Every structure is written in C-alpha cells, then in structure tokens.
Amino acid sequence: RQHDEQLMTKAEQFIIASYRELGKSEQEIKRRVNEIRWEVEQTGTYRHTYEELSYGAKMAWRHSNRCIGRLFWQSLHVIDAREAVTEEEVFSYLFHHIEVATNGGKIRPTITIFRPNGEVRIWNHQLIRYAGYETEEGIIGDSSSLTFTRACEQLGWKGEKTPFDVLPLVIQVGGQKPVWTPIPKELVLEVPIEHPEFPWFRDLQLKWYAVPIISDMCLEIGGIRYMAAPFNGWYMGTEIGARNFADDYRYNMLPKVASCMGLDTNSNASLWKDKALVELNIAVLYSYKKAGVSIVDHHTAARQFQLFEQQEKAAGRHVTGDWTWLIPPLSPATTHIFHRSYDNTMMLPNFFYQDRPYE
Amino acid sequence: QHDEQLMTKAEQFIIASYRELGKSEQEIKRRVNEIRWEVEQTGTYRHTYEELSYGAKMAWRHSNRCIGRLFWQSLHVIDAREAVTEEEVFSYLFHHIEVATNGGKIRPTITIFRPNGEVRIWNHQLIRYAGYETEEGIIGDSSSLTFTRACEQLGWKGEKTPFDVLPLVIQVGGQKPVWTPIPKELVLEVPIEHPEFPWFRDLQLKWYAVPIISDMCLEIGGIRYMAAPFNGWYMGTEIGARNFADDYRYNMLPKVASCMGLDTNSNASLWKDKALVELNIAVLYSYKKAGVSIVDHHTAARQFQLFEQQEKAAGRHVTGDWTWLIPPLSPATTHIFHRSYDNTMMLPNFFYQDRPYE
Ligand code: HEM
Ligand code: HEM
Ligand SMILES: NC(=[NH2+])NCCC[C@H](N)C(=O)O
Ligand SMILES: NC(=[NH2+])NCCC[C@H](N)C(=O)O
C-alpha cells in the first residue's frame, strides 16, 4: 500500500516539529511515532491527541499564507467534535460553534474538528451566510451563494427572497446526502450599517452578520484529513465594506452610496468610486463597534501582521505568505505588506479547498 | 550558444512580425536570409525602419506590467542608431523630451539607440528628482539617492532641495560617463493644488510630466538596444499614491491629513485613506489645470480591458502581471483585481539591467 507509506511520513514529520515546538523531548517522539506505525498498520490510519489537534489546529492557522491576521494563532479555541457520529449530534456542535464563536459580541477565534476522512462533511462555505437567487429579472442576495441556495431549495428549503435571507445548515454524515436545519433566528447576531456623519446611510437598509465561520474547507494535520472543521476569527472592515458590499457582482453598493452622498457618477476622474469606498468602510468599522462586535480595520491588521513577522523570526520560523491575498483591498499601498514580497510555499498543517458536492 | 541563438530569435521574430502588419511570406522568406549571412560575416545585423518601429510597439504590447497597452500601436518611434557622439546622444535625449512633452499633449514616444551597449543611459528616468541623506533628515526621492550620489561623484552638484532636476548622465562607446544639465526650459512641471482645499497648494508640492524610463534594454530580434527610452502619460496613482504617499518616498499622507483637519490619532478612522483620495484628486485636478496628459485608474483599467478585448478578437493571447496591473488605491473596483493573468514574457519586451553605479 502507498497510502500508509505516505500518511506515515506526514505523521512522522508532524510529530517531529509538533512535539518539538511543544518543547517535549526526543524519546516521546519515537514513543509516539511508534504507536502510530503500529496503529497505521493494524487499522489503516491513526488518531490524534488533544494537543495534537489542538496545537495542530493552531499550526494550520499559522501556516495559512492567505491570512493577514495570523498574530493570534496560538489563542485558538479548539473543540474536539470527533466523537460525533449522528446527524443530530453534528448539528448541535455546529449550533454551539456559532454561539461560543459569537460570544454575544466579543467574537472568539475558534475551530471545531469533526470525525476525519469524510465521515462528516458540512456543505456550507460559511455557517452563517446570505442566500443567493436569480429571479425572472434581477439577482437577489449574495451572488456568491447562488449554487448553494439552488441546492438548498432543491432539498425542500425555501427563503423569503430578501437580500438577506439566512441560509440553513446542511450537512452530510456517514453516507446518503444531506439534511438541513433552519438556523435559529436568535442565534444569528447581526449588525445594521450606519454612518456616523451621514444619517441617510441607513435608508440604504444594509446589514451584515458578525462572525464569518468558514467551513467548506478541509484541515490536514499529520496526514489525517479532517474534511469538516469549521473555524472563524473576526471580520476586517474592508472585507464587508470593500468586497461584500462594493463589488459589481456582489451587493454592488458603491454608486447608490456615492449618489446619496452628493458626488457625481458622471466622471471617473472625480474618484467618486474611491470616496464612496472610504465612507462605506467607515460606516462598517463604525457600525460594528457601536454594536460591540469584534472587528479590526485593515491598518491595524497589517500592523499586527507585522508584529507576527517580528514574532515569527524571534522564534526562528521563516514566514510564508500570499501577497495577492494580503494586500488590503483598500489603500493597499499604505501597509508595509505591499512593499515587500512573500514565499507562497504551503507548510503543513494547513487549510485546503475541496470540491463542492452541490456542483 | 551565442550567434546561432541569435538567428533562432531573429527568425522567430520576422515571422510573427511580418504576419500581423499584413504582408506576405514572400519576403519573411527572402529577407530572413540576408540575416543569416550578415551574422556569418559581422556577427549580428540591423533592422529596418519598419521593423524596429513595430517591433518596439510589440514590446510595449508585450509589457506584462503595463495597464496602458490600449495604445501600443500608436507609439511614436524615433530612429537614432546613427548617433555615436556624446554631444549627439544628448540632443536626441533633448528631442525626446520636447516631442514627448509636446507642450502638454504628451506623445507616447521611444528613441532607439545603437545596440550592444555602444550607448548606455544611466538615469532611471530622464526627468527625475535627486535624493540626499542629510545629517538629520533625508531630502528628495529616497529612490534616486544612490544614483545621485554617483552624479555628485562625477562633479555634479545639487541645490539640495525636494525637487532638483537630476542631470542626464550617459556613457558611450566604452568609458567615461559624461553629464550635462538639462535646459530648464525643457522640464515641464505641474504644481499640485486642490480644487476645494485652497490650503493644499501651501504644501508646495510639484511633479514633472513625462515619465521617460530610460534604463531598460528592449530586446527585439535578438538585438539588445541597451539604450532605448520610452514614455507615456502618467496615471494619477503613480504620483499621488506612490511617489507622494509611501513613507519612504515623499511621505505626504499625514500632513495632507493634518491640513485637511482629520484625526491622525486612530486608524479605525481611516485617516490615511481619506487622505489618499484627496491627494489623488489633488493630482488629477492639477495635471488637468496645466493641460498635461494624465489618466485615472478607473479610466485606465477600463482601457486595459478594451486592450484585452481587441487582443482576443484579433486572435492574440493577453499576458500580464496582476500584481503590477492593479492600481494602488481601490484595486477591487477594476475588472483587473478580479481575474487572473498570464505573467509569461512574450518578446520583444523591455527588461531590467544592472545599474553601473551600484
Ligand atoms: C482574528 C481574526 C482573523 C482575521 C482578522 C483574519 C483575516 C483574514 C482575512 C482578511 C482573510 C482574507 C479574506 C478574503 O479575502 O476573503 C483571511 C483568510 C483566511 N483565514 Fe484568516 N483571519 C482571522 C482568523 C482566522 C482563523 C481563526 C483561521 C483559522 C483557524 C483563519 C483561516 C484563514 C484561511 C485558511 C484563510 C483563507 C480563505 C480562503 O482561502 O478562501 N482565519 N483571514
Ligand atoms: C499610454 C500611457 C501609458 C500608461 C497609462 C502606462 C502606465 C503604466 C503604469 C501605471 C505602470 C506601473 C508603473 C509603476 O508602478 O512603476 C507601467 C509600467 C510599464 N510600462 Fe507603461 N504606460 C503607458 C505607456 C507606455 C509605453 C509607451 C511603453 C513602452 C513603449 C510602456 C512600457 C511599460 C513597461 C516596460 C513598464 C515596466 C516598468 C518597470 O518595470 O519599472 N508604457 N506603465
Ligand atoms: N476575517 C475572516 N475570518 N474572514 C474569513 C473570510 C470571510 C469572507 N471574506 C467574507 O467576507 O465572508
Ligand atoms: N506611466 C508610465 N509610463 N510610468 C512609468 C513609470 C513612472 C513611475 N511610476 C513614476 O511615478 O515616476
């Protein structure tokens, strides 16, 4: 076999840097690699400890090239949801993650591992996410949710068809296909957009959810592949205000914003697009704090990312990254990141993409 | 190895080269031959007015890092493979400036020189500001510190201010870099002032009009014209987003922010951002009140997008460098940022080349 040949290697190099950064020992490494060789053979795969997944989870986040807020990688609250085998059970850990993660405001960076190898498989990109619809004429909702919604709909689900319908959790377990569960109206904390200097900014009837719990991603650690492992940090103004809210294909809100704010859309040379972006992001950063939701602006992130670079060197590790995904989508030339280059090599553990079942 | 390699490149070139302009194999076939012998006798060859012209425009077109390719085929070329005197190489440089600056309506022009380093222009750009590291402080463009140091080494001396015009330093034949200050009359300068903020012009900032990069050697048909200056018309960002904003460049963000009465005590106030905009609007406004060609990124990326269309409808592949294409401010409001490009180098193209003073 050549799955037990590779998997063995991945495991061996994991435990090595893993236990070694933990300041463990050299004996307990072989002691552990031993249990793993014996086990990978008699059973065909092995199982981690909760200092293995725990610290291993934090290592995957540290190793995420496309992430700007890696500073707080060690402060990750990991949850062992591996002992879940029933669809009911899965669901609860997912309702919990949301909760704990939200923390009625001061959002907690948390990851919840599940039975690996695909024994569990959540479908949603993000646990909380707005629906996508394409009606007779007009694109309603979040265009980047179309396919998924059209999959929920096909499973008996139906929305109100408003620009902010909260999609439902829909997971697949042991085999078959999926099941969904509307996600509690009082579980999804939201933030209404208001601008501190333009009162009309609310007639724009805009709003966004608090915690982005990405989940359609697989988590590899030591060779084991955790196809279902939700994780979340806290949003960055630009994310909502410079992408979700300002892109053509998404909620394309820039023009209306500009209009209401008196600028003229006639000529580009007036940079109305840009001025809008500022206010539209100001509104978001502003809004969230006012509600108490944990948020961070793009300037601070970079700065904290810079601290991450300093810290990582003081530890001896070199830093890996992805420039195309680090530069904040707004005034990116005002962050050190932009004036330097990064090595996009992926070091395990890391997070990866995976084919979407609904496509 | 070296001379056979040349024919390989030289052929690959006349083919596609002749293809497009719309002529006929009977020639590519026949004039690709005299280049086989002329390389067996001397050791290279010489282009035709028709060849390096288009072939230069091809290079532009092949610029993976240029958002201004919608006008590749309107590049005013300028032959000068017949200059061999330092005094000559200078007046041509002076020409490029005048013709290009065109009293304002900037003309996209290039000037090809004798190849294989018989001519070497040292300056990054013909018109560019000097840089100094003074005891306490740094003056000018931190970017041209090193080069300037060189100019002073050759006897040049600057009034040590934020906007001194560097001198044109060229090398010819083989040695002794000579320099000669540019006629003040030839450097057109735009004063940055704000359409709404009357107190902006008080920051006493200015900038030249023509970015004539001059230290890249544009290969074409295996011929390295170490010297071959080219330009276009600025894009607001280049000036009010980089040159004037980076903390190492003119670090102008905080003062404009201050002068424009914002709060520079917190980033969650996006004070740098509001400032970037107003500084950029400040440029575009100014350059226009002077009558100098200049494009904004929204309009620019738009055009690049047209260049994309026209490249495909004409059955060509578009190659680019996303990281260089996306503008420094509001990159996610341009089609660019949202798609992927092919950073493959199609020659003829412009390249980098070691700085004789470092
Ligand atoms: C502390 C709050 C956090 C901040 C400020 C932060 C910020 C960011 C930002 C701005 C991006 C780019 C998002 C986009 O362009 O769509 C990103 C991507 C990413 N983040 Fe972080 N993050 C945080 C926490 C986390 C946590 C807890 C994990 C992992 C346990 C994580 C894993 C990732 C991954 C894997 C990506 C890539 C997304 C993809 O490939 O689609 N982040 N993060
Ligand atoms: C129509 C006006 C033009 C515009 C708007 C334009 C704009 C740009 C911009 C904004 C950059 C990035 C500059 C930087 O970040 O330093 C660039 C780079 C470049 N462009 Fe253009 N361009 C124009 C004309 C030309 C012409 C006439 C040529 C060639 C014949 C050319 C050759 C290139 C090259 C080779 C680079 C790379 C410079 C480097 O690597 O430092 N451009 N251009
Ligand atoms: N700060 C984060 N954890 N971001 C995760 C990705 C969220 C995604 N960009 C969104 O707007 O939904
Ligand atoms: N539009 C151009 N051709 N620019 C050439 C590079 C000029 C450089 N960005 C500068 O600001 O001086």
PDB file of C-alpha atoms in Angstrom, chain A residues 197 242-243 246-249 254 268-275 277-279 281-282 285-286 289 297-300 303 323-324 327-335 338-339, chain B residues 196 241-242 245-248 253 266-274 276-278 280-281 284-285 296-299 302 322-324 326-333 337-338:
ATOM      1  CA  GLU A 197     -21.708  61.561   9.643  1.00  0.00           C
ATOM      2  CA  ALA A 242     -14.605  46.761   0.232  1.00  0.00           C
ATOM      3  CA  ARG A 243     -15.703  43.433  -1.177  1.00  0.00           C
ATOM      4  CA  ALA A 246     -18.692  47.277  -3.057  1.00  0.00           C
ATOM      5  CA  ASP A 247     -18.173  44.692  -5.806  1.00  0.00           C
ATOM      6  CA  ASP A 248     -20.175  44.768  -9.020  1.00  0.00           C
ATOM      7  CA  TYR A 249     -21.026  41.091  -8.878  1.00  0.00           C
ATOM      8  CA  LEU A 254     -20.845  51.905  -4.379  1.00  0.00           C
ATOM      9  CA  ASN A 268     -14.265  58.744 -13.038  1.00  0.00           C
ATOM     10  CA  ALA A 269     -11.625  61.462 -12.677  1.00  0.00           C
ATOM     11  CA  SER A 270     -13.547  62.735  -9.637  1.00  0.00           C
ATOM     12  CA  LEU A 271     -12.850  59.434  -7.986  1.00  0.00           C
ATOM     13  CA  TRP A 272     -16.375  59.097  -6.637  1.00  0.00           C
ATOM     14  CA  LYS A 273     -15.828  55.339  -6.570  1.00  0.00           C
ATOM     15  CA  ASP A 274     -12.966  55.803  -4.105  1.00  0.00           C
ATOM     16  CA  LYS A 275     -14.572  58.413  -1.839  1.00  0.00           C
ATOM     17  CA  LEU A 277     -15.281  53.216  -0.507  1.00  0.00           C
ATOM     18  CA  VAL A 278     -13.941  55.265   2.365  1.00  0.00           C
ATOM     19  CA  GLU A 279     -17.364  56.173   3.798  1.00  0.00           C
ATOM     20  CA  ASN A 281     -15.941  51.189   5.075  1.00  0.00           C
ATOM     21  CA  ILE A 282     -16.052  53.906   7.697  1.00  0.00           C
ATOM     22  CA  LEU A 285     -15.972  49.757  11.098  1.00  0.00           C
ATOM     23  CA  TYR A 286     -18.099  52.369  12.858  1.00  0.00           C
ATOM     24  CA  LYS A 289     -18.004  48.767  17.264  1.00  0.00           C
ATOM     25  CA  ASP A 297      -9.625  47.716  10.332  1.00  0.00           C
ATOM     26  CA  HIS A 298      -7.106  46.952   7.596  1.00  0.00           C
ATOM     27  CA  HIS A 299      -4.467  49.242   9.017  1.00  0.00           C
ATOM     28  CA  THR A 300      -4.284  47.532  12.395  1.00  0.00           C
ATOM     29  CA  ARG A 303       0.395  46.306  11.785  1.00  0.00           C
ATOM     30  CA  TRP A 323       0.778  38.902  -1.398  1.00  0.00           C
ATOM     31  CA  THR A 324      -2.241  38.795  -3.742  1.00  0.00           C
ATOM     32  CA  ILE A 327      -2.871  43.453   0.467  1.00  0.00           C
ATOM     33  CA  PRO A 328      -5.960  45.039   1.946  1.00  0.00           C
ATOM     34  CA  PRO A 329      -8.449  45.763  -0.888  1.00  0.00           C
ATOM     35  CA  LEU A 330      -8.299  49.428   0.095  1.00  0.00           C
ATOM     36  CA  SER A 331      -5.268  51.741   0.095  1.00  0.00           C
ATOM     37  CA  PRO A 332      -3.031  48.622  -0.020  1.00  0.00           C
ATOM     38  CA  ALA A 333      -0.005  50.791  -0.714  1.00  0.00           C
ATOM     39  CA  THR A 334      -0.153  52.137   2.870  1.00  0.00           C
ATOM     40  CA  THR A 335       0.619  48.792   4.502  1.00  0.00           C
ATOM     41  CA  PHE A 338       2.593  45.878  -0.195  1.00  0.00           C
ATOM     42  CA  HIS A 339       6.242  46.961  -0.355  1.00  0.00           C
TER      43      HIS A 339
ATOM     44  CA  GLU B 196     -11.693  72.531  -2.963  1.00  0.00           C
ATOM     45  CA  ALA B 241      -0.436  57.193  -4.436  1.00  0.00           C
ATOM     46  CA  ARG B 242       3.151  56.026  -4.559  1.00  0.00           C
ATOM     47  CA  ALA B 245       2.470  58.587  -0.371  1.00  0.00           C
ATOM     48  CA  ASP B 246       4.957  55.870   0.562  1.00  0.00           C
ATOM     49  CA  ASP B 247       6.627  56.587   3.880  1.00  0.00           C
ATOM     50  CA  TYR B 248       9.993  56.353   2.151  1.00  0.00           C
ATOM     51  CA  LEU B 253      -0.076  61.429   3.690  1.00  0.00           C
ATOM     52  CA  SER B 266      -6.543  56.436  15.077  1.00  0.00           C
ATOM     53  CA  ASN B 267      -6.508  54.116  12.102  1.00  0.00           C
ATOM     54  CA  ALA B 268     -10.050  52.911  12.761  1.00  0.00           C
ATOM     55  CA  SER B 269     -10.828  56.380  11.355  1.00  0.00           C
ATOM     56  CA  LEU B 270      -9.242  55.549   8.048  1.00  0.00           C
ATOM     57  CA  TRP B 271      -7.460  58.876   8.044  1.00  0.00           C
ATOM     58  CA  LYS B 272      -4.766  57.672   5.654  1.00  0.00           C
ATOM     59  CA  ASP B 273      -7.469  56.589   3.257  1.00  0.00           C
ATOM     60  CA  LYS B 274      -9.498  59.807   3.188  1.00  0.00           C
ATOM     61  CA  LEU B 276      -5.093  59.150  -0.214  1.00  0.00           C
ATOM     62  CA  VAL B 277      -8.230  60.059  -2.106  1.00  0.00           C
ATOM     63  CA  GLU B 278      -7.918  63.814  -1.584  1.00  0.00           C
ATOM     64  CA  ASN B 280      -5.026  61.766  -5.680  1.00  0.00           C
ATOM     65  CA  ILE B 281      -7.916  64.018  -6.649  1.00  0.00           C
ATOM     66  CA  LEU B 284      -5.655  64.633 -11.389  1.00  0.00           C
ATOM     67  CA  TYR B 285      -7.119  68.071 -10.805  1.00  0.00           C
ATOM     68  CA  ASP B 296      -7.009  57.988 -13.690  1.00  0.00           C
ATOM     69  CA  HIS B 297      -7.016  54.292 -12.731  1.00  0.00           C
ATOM     70  CA  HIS B 298     -10.685  53.720 -13.249  1.00  0.00           C
ATOM     71  CA  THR B 299     -10.437  55.051 -16.800  1.00  0.00           C
ATOM     72  CA  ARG B 302     -11.163  50.380 -18.416  1.00  0.00           C
ATOM     73  CA  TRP B 322      -1.682  41.131 -11.880  1.00  0.00           C
ATOM     74  CA  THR B 323       0.442  42.496  -9.011  1.00  0.00           C
ATOM     75  CA  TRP B 324       1.662  45.338 -11.208  1.00  0.00           C
ATOM     76  CA  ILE B 326      -3.865  46.517 -10.083  1.00  0.00           C
ATOM     77  CA  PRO B 327      -3.739  50.228  -9.044  1.00  0.00           C
ATOM     78  CA  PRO B 328      -2.531  51.282  -5.536  1.00  0.00           C
ATOM     79  CA  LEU B 329      -5.887  52.630  -4.469  1.00  0.00           C
ATOM     80  CA  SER B 330      -9.251  50.870  -4.729  1.00  0.00           C
ATOM     81  CA  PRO B 331      -7.916  47.857  -6.607  1.00  0.00           C
ATOM     82  CA  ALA B 332     -11.227  45.982  -6.239  1.00  0.00           C
ATOM     83  CA  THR B 333     -13.194  48.452  -8.354  1.00  0.00           C
ATOM     84  CA  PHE B 337      -8.213  42.706  -9.500  1.00  0.00           C
ATOM     85  CA  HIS B 338     -10.980  40.114 -10.041  1.00  0.00           C
TER      86      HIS B 338
END
